[PDB]
Amino acid sequence: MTLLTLSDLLTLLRECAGEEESIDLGGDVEDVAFDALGYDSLALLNTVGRIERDYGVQLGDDAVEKATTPRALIEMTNASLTGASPSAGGAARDK
C-alpha cells in the first residue's frame, strides 16, 4: 500500500482526540513525545488501530511501545509499506 506521512498520523490523531485541525499543536511536534504534546495512549491506541487496518501494517506489535513520537509510528508504517511484506528469510547454505 501507500506509505505514510506526518500529515496523515496527525489528522488521524486529530480525529481521535476530536480536535479541529490535524496539527493543532502548530507543527513543532514531530520529534516530541506523545505525552510531551498532550497525548496519553488511549487515543494513540485507537489511531494506531486505524492505521494498522487502513495501511495494513504489521512489522511488530511492540512498535506502539517504542513509538514515542509521530515519526516513530510513521517510520514503523513507512518501513512496513516500503518493506513490501516479509518473506521469512533466505540464508546461504545450499546450492
- Quote the domain boundaries for residue 47: 1-95
Residue by residue, DSSP assigns 22-72 as TT-S-S--SSS-HHHHT--SHHHHHHHHHHHHHT---S-TTHHHH--SHHH
Query: What is the distance between the terminal CA atoms of the chain, rounded to a whole angstrom?
Result: 34
**Cα–Cα–Cα angle for 34, 37, 41, nearest 5°?**
35
Number of structural domains in the chain: 1
Please state, in angstroms and rounded to a whole number, the distance separating the CA atoms of residues 6 and 87.
28
Read off the CATH number of the domain in which 50 is found.
1.10.1200.10
| Dihedral sign for Cα atoms in the order 40, 68, 60, 86 | positive
Determined by: NMR
What is the biggest distance separating any 2 CA atoms in the chain, rounded to whole angstroms? 60
